[PDB]
Design a protein. Structure first.
Ligand code: HEC
Ligand code: HEC
Ligand code: HEC
Ligand code: HEC
Ligand code: SMA
Ligand code: UQ2
Lengths: 75, 60, 49, 378, 241, 67, 49, 54, 54
């Protein structure tokens, strides 16, 4: 039930925009793009990766332990 | 004004009806040219193998 | 289920007290070499192997 | 005065899909809502064209499905689009829930609570669907999941036999499961509209969890085009699966006809049930195991009451970010265990993962939010 | 006895992503089915007309159908006669019952072969390994020898007698009927039996990949073109005094 | 007379280095079992170990000969 | 004092045929729309198939 | 729409499917029917506007 | 069941074997005719009272 012209109050803010036909869709796509993804990765790796390596270690150990347990030796 | 995207726009894209006409005429000739190509690629990557290449062994 | 002598040996000997559902083997059969059971698991209804 | 704006039908379309003020701001994680709609109509459309040739009798049900895959002109794409779309439906559901959990979108109580109903309804629908081709996984799937009701004390047995049609899964079970599986997606579709109706009341949340009224953009052309791209990725992901690996996400055992005398050695759920399966069997108790299963999905309705943080989103909350990912990886752990037999290392680590699932949501994530409040002097 | 062995990766001509079934090998593999397996194994979901596209001609498959006796629905006196049988006939059943299947094969039921590649983990690799890898028992274990030794079978004791060897019938084109090739061709046929769509889905797949290689960068450019206005926008804040 | 290429390949596979060790420990199992009074201790484990290394090598090679 | 507002430089984002402020955009107008509409025209053709 | 040269196996299975869904499609069109109606409210026996006495 | 061999048999299975299957079947049958009586009354009302001007 929310409409433009009724959302909120904003004062003293200028927005400059260009037409889509004046500008490139892929402005500096690799030159600026790659540096950004690396920066985004660095920012989040310590938050995202360590639970999944913790999954990976419990996976690797668990599969190994199950394999070894269904072998005998001195009996 | 020599440039080709310009003449493409001037003759075909400016009007939406002409734009639609150039898409539908475009889609007819694409369906032929793509199915021609994509079959010929699939047939060449499977050199004998299919019943189209076996066909001649069993007679007329 | 036809039961060997080693099979009946284990069932009479093991503890009635330590089961979840307390029964003797002798009150679960009539003649001790024949056990007749409905092959439906009491959990969620699969066939025990 | 616009025809788009004042026509009583187009009004509804315009205020939902065109002029709707949306944040400048919302990422790819917001694509899953439309993708769930695409999934819903894909499953409706293929499901309709499968219903045109399927017979719901025990003698003939397996035969009709294979008649579709061999004799029916292009019956094979329709059947495996349907099969892999159901798995696509689940990938999108899980992404969509996780987005909501991360970004604090659950603070929209009605939208979220309707979402929880939508999860349970699509789970029940897809259980029914898997019963229909009458393979081995179909039969025992039907056996186990219906029997969950038998854990309700005093009346549970009467209830299971009430939905079965008799003392066992039978002729009566399959014909009604076809009927239940036909209607329920349309009921889902109606609940999806109420879900959207409650949402439009607030508009969308965004990555920052900060109100975005200061910077709204029209849904068209920005999110119409971002949604088209997102759908074209969904078509890639789906059409990779049907055309290059149609059976990767299913079970080979469902290609042998149903057999009430033998349950297979290996039996596991469909991949998307494996975490909940792992939770229930970690408990060596009937009532507790099913109570944990119910609680594993119904917990989402407690998450709003347990939000301690003075911020909405997890974007500026690193302790919570870590514990969110521990939750995802623990869920990934539980689907791995679900896939494995009830033997030595797997019993314990699955028990610990079950405990961690409930400890993370109930205790550890609310405490993280308080610590984060205290660290910002809040 | 609970211990398992899993099949190795055989390089099937149809193992690759955009790769046909060998229809010359489907032919030879049907020949393995008709002569060896159809004595024991049902194939209820394949008919003679299915071969007409695939390996045989219309005339070849009609002459092959005209070899069995099939019961036909009633004459206008009310009795069940027999006929040469057409392309519409599904492949003929040994045994009227599962119980008559169990009775001839010493307790054990031979399952249908219409599904069998899609119905076992490993697919054709397993069926190849179960066929070509028939072997002698190790010391310590003996069979009640209605059942035989196979390592690839779960539990190691299989009811099936080792049904493939050097020169069980000849191949029509002239091909050496070594057990390896008899097993190769039948597994190539049983893949087609499980999945006749196989070659069509891979054809549409190449079309899907090539189309998506056009449409994904194009729709991306369309979306970027519109998002241009926002992505390059500049803000200034200009408060009073 | 009749030449199965699997016979040519299996012999060529068994002479490779992994198989030599796994045939060895199977043979050492072979002598152990006839020896004892009424041993249950199987050579299932050591046969399947050897077949694992053998059939892996068989699969890499066999189809290059067959038509 | 609103006369202090200049529109900031957009050269970083501009199409190459539109970087010269000394030269008319009307000349590159047919070409630039041409390229962008050809993209949507091909997509429609692609989707149509 | 038959599934072949005559009414057959194919005809009945799809007619069950078509007959199942169509009442729900009807139900949705009944809502749009009501939506257009509420725009004016009801007519009455006289055919005269009744805003004077709702 | 929507197969030609069994469709007649399932409907009569409803009317004889299914607990109260007979009321459900004939409620359905006569409700379809009720649906038509109501439709025709509803159209005729609309025709008479000029409700078609909506
Ligand atoms: C009589 C001996 C035969 C012949 C000539 C063949 N089969 Fe089959 N088969 C037979 C039996 C008794 C069984 C049941 C085994 C048991 O459960 O104890 C089977 C089963 C198979 C299977 C399934 C094995 C499995 O569970 O994984 C397959 C894949 C199979 N048979 C294939 C097969 C092929 C390819 C044949 C021609 C070479 C063949 N069979 C013939 C009995 C017999
Ligand atoms: C248990 C939670 C939950 C489930 C399951 C769920 N939703 Fe939502 N959905 C939400 C919440 C919360 C939002 C608001 C997200 C926001 O603004 O950040 C939402 C937003 C959406 C949106 C629009 C914005 C967006 O996120 O893309 C659509 C469309 C959507 N839901 C439809 C569906 C459909 C269709 C289903 C499957 C039937 C479904 N949802 C399942 C809770 C969920
Ligand atoms: C118009 C009826 C119809 C609708 C709508 C429907 N389906 Fe189905 N579905 C079927 C039929 C018939 C089958 C049996 C054919 C088959 O097994 O593929 C089936 C099969 C399935 C299967 C088993 C797939 C397999 O073959 O292994 C699943 C899972 C499934 N449906 C889930 C869904 C989901 C999720 C939805 C959307 C909420 C849905 N279906 C919509 C009729 C429907
Ligand atoms: C071909 C004409 C026609 C058909 C058929 C028809 N409607 Fe209507 N309906 C109308 C008109 C016109 C009105 C307005 C009557 C008035 O205000 O006098 C209306 C009014 C109604 C009303 C509310 C006022 C009233 O008259 O009771 C309901 C409810 C209704 N329609 C539902 C239905 C349902 C349900 C169906 C069956 C699916 C249906 N209609 C079939 C034309 C029709
Ligand atoms: C008319 C009555 C109806 C429709 C009742 C519906 C109840 C529906 C449920 O809630 C919506 C349910 C689907 C949901 O539980 C929360 C799932 C996640 C349960 C996951 C599930 O799957 C299994 C499965 O798939 C199997 O087959 C391959 C076999 C199984 O045992 C071995 C299971 C199983 O043990 C469990 C817990
Ligand atoms: C304010 O956020 C919204 C979005 O932005 C992320 C959307 O993308 C969509 C688009 C949703 C579609 C196409 C599914 C429709 C479902 C049914 C059952 C017809 C809606 C409605 C929405 O409200």
């Amino acid at each position: 039930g929310r409409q433009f012209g009724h959302l909120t109050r904003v004062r003293h803010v200028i927005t400059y925009s260009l037409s889509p036909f004046e500008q490139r869709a892929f402005p500096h796509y690799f030159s600026k793009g790659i540096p950004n993804v690396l920066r985004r990765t660095r920012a989040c790796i310590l938050r995202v990766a360590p639970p999944f390596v913790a999954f990976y270690l419990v996976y690797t150990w668990g599969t190994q332990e199950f394999e070894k347990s269904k072998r005998k030796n001195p009996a | 004004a020599p440039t080709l995207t310009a003449r493409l726009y001037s003759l075909l894209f400016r009007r939406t009806s002409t734009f639609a006409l150039t898409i539908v005429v475009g889609a007819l000739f694409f369906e032929r040219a793509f199915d021609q190509g994509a079959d010929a690629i699939y047939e060449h990557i499977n050199e004998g193998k299919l019943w189209k290449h076996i066909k001649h062994k069993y007679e007329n | 289920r036809h039961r060997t002598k080693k099979e009946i040996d284990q069932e009479a000997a093991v503890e009635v007290s330590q089961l979840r559902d307390p029964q003797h083997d002798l009150e679960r059969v009539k003649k001790p070499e024949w056990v007749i059971l409905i092959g439906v698991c009491t959990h969620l209804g699969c066939v025990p192997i | 005065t616009n025809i788009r704006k004042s026509h009583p039908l187009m009004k509804i379309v315009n205020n939902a899909f065109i002029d709707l003020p949306a944040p400048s701001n919302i990422s790819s994680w917001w694509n899953f809502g439309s993708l769930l709609g695409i999934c819903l109509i894909l499953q409706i459309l293929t499901g309709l064209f499968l219903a045109m040739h399927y017979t719901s009798d025990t003698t003939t049900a397996f035969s009709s499905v294979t008649h579709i895959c061999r004799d029916v002109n292009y019956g094979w794409i329709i059947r495996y689009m349907h099969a892999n779309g159901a798995s696509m439906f689940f990938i999108c559901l899980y992404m969509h829930v996780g987005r909501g959990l991360y970004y604090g979108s659950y603070t929209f109580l009605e939208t979220w609570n309707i979402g929880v109903i939508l999860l349970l309804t699509v789970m029940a629908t897809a259980f029914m669907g898997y019963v229909l081709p009458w393979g081995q996984m179909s039969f025992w799937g039907a056996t186990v999941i219906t029997n969950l009701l038998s854990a309700i004390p005093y009346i549970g047995t009467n209830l299971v036999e009430w939905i079965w049609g008799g003392f066992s899964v039978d002729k009566a079970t399959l014909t009604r499961f076809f009927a239940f599986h036909f209607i329920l997606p349309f009921i889902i579709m109606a609940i999806a509209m109420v879900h959207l109706l409650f949402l439009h009341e607030t508009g969308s949340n965004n990555p920052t969890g900060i109100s975005s009224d200061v910077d709204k953009i029209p849904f068209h052309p920005y999110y119409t085009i971002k949604d088209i791209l997102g759908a074209l990725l969904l078509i890639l992901a789906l059409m990779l699966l049907v055309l290059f690996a149609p059976d990767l996400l299913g079970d080979p055992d469902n290609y042998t006809p149903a057999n009430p005398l033998n349950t297979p050695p290996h039996i596991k759920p469909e991949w998307y049930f494996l975490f909940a399966y792992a939770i229930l069997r970690s408990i060596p108790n009937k009532l507790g195991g099913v109570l944990a299963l119910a609680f594993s999905i119904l917990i989402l309705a407690l998450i709003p009451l347990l939000h301690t943080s003075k911020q909405r989103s997890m974007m500026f909350r690193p302790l919570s970010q870590c514990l969110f990912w521990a939750l995802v990886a623990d869920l990934l752990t539980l689907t791995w265990i679900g896939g494995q037999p009830v033997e030595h290392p797997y019993i314990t680590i699955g028990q610990l993962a079950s405990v961690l699932y409930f400890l993370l949501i109930l205790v550890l994530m609310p405490t993280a939010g308080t610590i984060e409040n205290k660290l910002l002097k809040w | 006895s609970d211990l398992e062995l899993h099949p190795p990766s055989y390089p099937w001509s149809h193992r690759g992503l955009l790769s046909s079934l060998d229809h010359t090998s489907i032919r030879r593999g049907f020949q393995v089915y008709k002569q060896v397996c159809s004595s024991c194994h049902s194939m209820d979901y394949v008919a003679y007309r299915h071969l007409v596209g695939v390996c045989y001609t219309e005339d070849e498959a009609k002459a092959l159908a005209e070899e069995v006796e099939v019961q036909d629905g009633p004459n206008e006196d009310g009795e069940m006669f027999m006929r040469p049988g057409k392309l519409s006939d599904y492949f003929p059943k040994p045994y009227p019952n599962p119980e008559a299947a169990r009775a001839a094969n010493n307790g054990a039921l031979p399952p249908d072969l219409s599904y069998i590649v899609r119905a076992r983990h490993g697919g054709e690799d397993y069926v190849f390994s179960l066929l070509t890898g028939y072997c002698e028992p190790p010391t310590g274990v003996s069979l009640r020898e209605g059942l035989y030794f196979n390592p690839y079978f779960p539990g190691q004791a299989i009811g099936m007698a080792p049904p493939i060897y050097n020169e069980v019938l000849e191949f029509d084109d002239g091909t050496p009927a070594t057990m390896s090739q008899v097993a190769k061709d039948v597994c190539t046929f049983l893949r087609w039996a499980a999945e006749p769509e196989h070659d069509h889905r891979k054809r549409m797949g190449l079309k899907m990949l090539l189309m998506m290689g056009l449409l994904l960068p194009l729709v991306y450019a369309m979306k970027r073109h519109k998002w241009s206005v926002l992505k390059s926008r500049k803000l200034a804040y200009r408060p009073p005094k | 007379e009749l030449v199965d290429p699997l016979t040519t390949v299996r012999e060529q596979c068994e002479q490779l280095e992994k198989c030599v060790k796994a045939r060895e420990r199977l043979e050492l199992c072979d002598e152990r079992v006839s020896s004892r009074s009424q041993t249950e201790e199987d050579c299932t484990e050591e046969l399947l170990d050897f077949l694992h290394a053998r059939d892996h090598c068989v699969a890499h090679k066999l189809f290059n000969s067959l038509k | 004092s609103h006369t202090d507002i200049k529109v900031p430089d957009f050269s970083d984002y501009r199409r190459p045929e539109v970087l010269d402020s000394t030269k008319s955009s009307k000349e590159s107008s047919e070409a630039r729309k041409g390229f962008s509409y050809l993209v949507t025209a091909t997509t429609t053709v692609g989707v149509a198939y």
